[PDB]
Design an enzyme around this catalytic site. Sequence first.
Site: not given
Ligand SMILES: [Mg+2]
Ligand SMILES: [Mg+2]
Lengths: 433, 432
Positions: B157, B166, B209, B244, B292, B317, B342, B369-372, B393
């Site tokens: 990210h 993360e 993010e 994460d 995670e 995840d 997700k 959770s969101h995605r990036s 998150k």
């Molecule tokens: Mg991922």
């Molecule tokens: Mg993840």
Amino acid sequence: SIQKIWAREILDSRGNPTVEVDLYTAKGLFRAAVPSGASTGIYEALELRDGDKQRYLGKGVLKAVDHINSTIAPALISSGLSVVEQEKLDNLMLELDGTENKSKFGANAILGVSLAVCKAGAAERELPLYRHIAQLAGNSDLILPVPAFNVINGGSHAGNKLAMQEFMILPVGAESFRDAMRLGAEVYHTLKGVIKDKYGKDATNVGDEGGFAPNILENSEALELVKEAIDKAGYTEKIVIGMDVAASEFYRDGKYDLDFKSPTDPSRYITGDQLGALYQDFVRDYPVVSIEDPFDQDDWAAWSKFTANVGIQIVGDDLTVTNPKRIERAVEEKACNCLLLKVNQIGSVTEAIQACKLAQENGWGVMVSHRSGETEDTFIADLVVGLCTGQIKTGAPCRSERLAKYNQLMRIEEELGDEARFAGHNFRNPSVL
Amino acid sequence: SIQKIWAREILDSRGNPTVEVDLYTAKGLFRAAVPSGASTGIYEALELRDGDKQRYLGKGVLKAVDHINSTIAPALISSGLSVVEQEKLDNLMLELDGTENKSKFGANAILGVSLAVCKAGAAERELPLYRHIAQLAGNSDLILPVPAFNVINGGSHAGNKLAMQEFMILPVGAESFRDAMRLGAEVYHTLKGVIKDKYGKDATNVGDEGGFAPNILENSEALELVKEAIDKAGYTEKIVIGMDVAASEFYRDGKYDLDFKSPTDPSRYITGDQLGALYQDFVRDYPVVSIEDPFDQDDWAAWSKFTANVGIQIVGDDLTVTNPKRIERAVEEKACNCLLLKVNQIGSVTEAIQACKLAQENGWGVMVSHRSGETEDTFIADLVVGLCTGQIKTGAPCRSERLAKYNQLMRIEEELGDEARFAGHNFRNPSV
Ligand SMILES: [Mg+2]
Ligand SMILES: [Mg+2]
Ligand SMILES: O=C(O)[C@@H](CO)OP(=O)(O)O
Ligand SMILES: [Mg+2]
Ligand SMILES: [Mg+2]
């Protein structure tokens, strides 16, 4: 009439509180939020913050929220005015605040209501917002603007030495707004690779407006990187460059400091004349067609001189603050030839429309703008189309407080169908199309 | 029944194309958009991209859009199914694609429509979206989640040397969701100062993010900075940390490369046992309460050994990819004790809710959770409340594809009035 108003504090794109207003009519719920600048001109209308150091380091907007909930809302409900009546409702709030600079309620309180009224007014007319705004402004044939994408961030918007604030790309040769979005994003992604290959992946993090924040000092280097990405993406003929110097941010004792984020050393400061000569080099060496705030907000003789000595667009932002009084002076002095239109510099939709009309009547361009602290609100997308200004800056194509506006302009273009026209090379003056 | 469905390409928060769907009923227009990951698990349902190297660097979604406009839209309209019939309409789309992993139309084609159907369903029911989702899931009470804010970004990210993806703060001791927002934002702004004081202004730009992206290599230095910020903001007793790791991104030849963004050198690769030792040191030395993807998506042995040797939350995840068949395996093997939810890893609302219910029935937490790559869509705010999961998150409190969800959770809490509850210290197991 308005049935109920409720305002709250939400967070903006930098994590700071700002104002949001829900407004209820028989048509349902309409919602707007207020943006917030970082490089704020001294002549802007007052942004009221709470100053409670125990909460958001003094940046709450509970005072603005309470002025809306408890004073402005019953005022506008008492009036019985339809939400379509934008000028009457705005005037009621300007009279009730009663100060020149909106220092009783805050321009943030007044604008949040003004925007929610405008959205509810469009719904009441059964019209998309951009068409309601066109009728408020007296325009018929609508045009999509050229987007101006701030792809390298400097100044007060980025962690780097780069003093000048924004280096923008404008796809003036695109075929449509949707095509302008492809050109802009392809150059932006190309630029990430140009920067990564030179400066490293650590130079490819972003600033407040979604542009890259490379670790560079020299403004010519930012221009060289943008030009390189334009050419590498294959769009040399179709994309040109704009800048926002935001020179008020680095004006110091009658000179200018191009390294103002380094510990203070007056021996590096330069004169306005040196700085103008630099801009003339940029205009010669790169496809720069627009420069905003080249000099400080009070350095009027430098603005008039420079504008008289160039053929490009010269944009007032902190000079003009979306403010008819300051615009009149800039017209008289021939200080610039385009107005940056920021609803929250002046504090109401009505006043912003008046400022836009005043600049257009004097042959200036108008570029609608976001603030560096934005929200998920998309009002300015319908505003630039309804006001037919031909140009908007609302971020790099990165961070969705930016893309929410760009996405909404793609939707508006789609909605207009065969009627859609793109300002293209007429971005300074689209009324001819 | 559905009157009109129309899909388009819009841009996500990284400037890449993604799918947006407008769906019209008698009640009006319902719009949804699809997110996109960067550190995408190999078992995720297919994200269909055009691959035209000349247009958006091969990342167009014209083919997914066309699958919606030319195939899915007319089939759903012709069916005459009401938008309240979420399961029948999602099952129809699964059968129209005909593949297990949604590789014919793309999970991004099917999910855009699934989400818009769910919004239109809520309107048909005259319910807010979170209450419609609770009815779909069989939940009768709603709880606001603890937010997990990613305040230092690493991995895939951000541009830095940090391998782990993360470093999140969770205000488990906040009084309410609105108070959790203030605590996260105050810590975030305090962190900017901590990082600027030590590393200078160049270290204060942000990743995908919205977390800061200081050019550091030690994952313990990220934890030290976060812990310092929590303490300087005055919130040691109320805010804990989650991570994460996204370890699938740095798995190499049966080992793990914690220096992966630097030139390849197998001599520095460590085993899963060594990586677990390093996590136990983080849990001893920092207020880490959740990790995670501590191992690769296929390294089942390491997951089950580590889960049985620690008490913290262990979130699947890429291991689980919001997929009931993988979650069944992870439940049997005791590989983890929380599911990251997700919707776009599985591709429909119906299957995401099934995944959630399966995890909860088996005693696991669930973190939505969101995605990036996110959009201005706020569906997952209503989703986390309606599924009563207790934790979400969805970004640093920075960049409005993050704030749009947090702001919507504040609105939901305000709407629920005296009925509003905050999961707080019960974030792992809100059913209590
Ligand atoms: Mg991922
Ligand atoms: Mg993840
Ligand atoms: O100076 C500007 O033009 C704006 C918009 O990019 O920035 P700020 O909102 O910080 O004033
Ligand atoms: Mg400014
Ligand atoms: Mg400016």
